[PDB]
Structure formats: C-alpha cells, structure tokens
Design a protein around this nucleic acid. Sequence first.
DNA 1: GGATCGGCTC
DNA 2: GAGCCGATCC
Length: 71
Amino acid sequence: GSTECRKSVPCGWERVVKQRLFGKTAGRFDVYFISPQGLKFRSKSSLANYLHKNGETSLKPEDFDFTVLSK
DNA sequence: GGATCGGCTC
DNA sequence: GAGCCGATCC
C-alpha cells in the first residue's frame, strides 16, 4: 500500500505499547521492550547491564526501537 | 525486580 | 501546552 513495515522490530525481542490510565499526563503513551526471556526493561543502563550480564555485548542501547513511525 | 503514577524541560 | 524521563510502592 502506501505504508509498509520496514526494519523497526528486531527479531527475538518483544514490544509493548499501552497508554496510561489517568493522571497529570492522562493521554500520554508508554512503550517498553521485554527481553526474549521475558525480562522487562525501560532504561538504557539496565539494558547495558542485562546484555553484559549474559556476556553478550553485541546489542547496543541504540538498538532498542521505541519509535512508532518506524525508524 | 516488577508495576503504577507524576515531575521537569522545551 | 506538548513531549520525555524519574520517582514511588510492593
């Protein structure tokens, strides 16, 4: 069509997007990625620790895709 | 570590 | 007013 689904969702990783209920920002959107093992993460540092924890450092904090318009 | 809500900057 | 990150509770 007019919009495709290019690269934006790395394989082996899960993405979740849910809008917050109500608050001082009622209407905002929250998104986060859950490691393959089911580990939830929302911080670049925590990610750098998780990756290093398994010994794998190939992945980078810049690999995470939080955008909604792809890249 | 996990889940939910609010504070700060532009 | 809008957008992004941090603080609080368990």
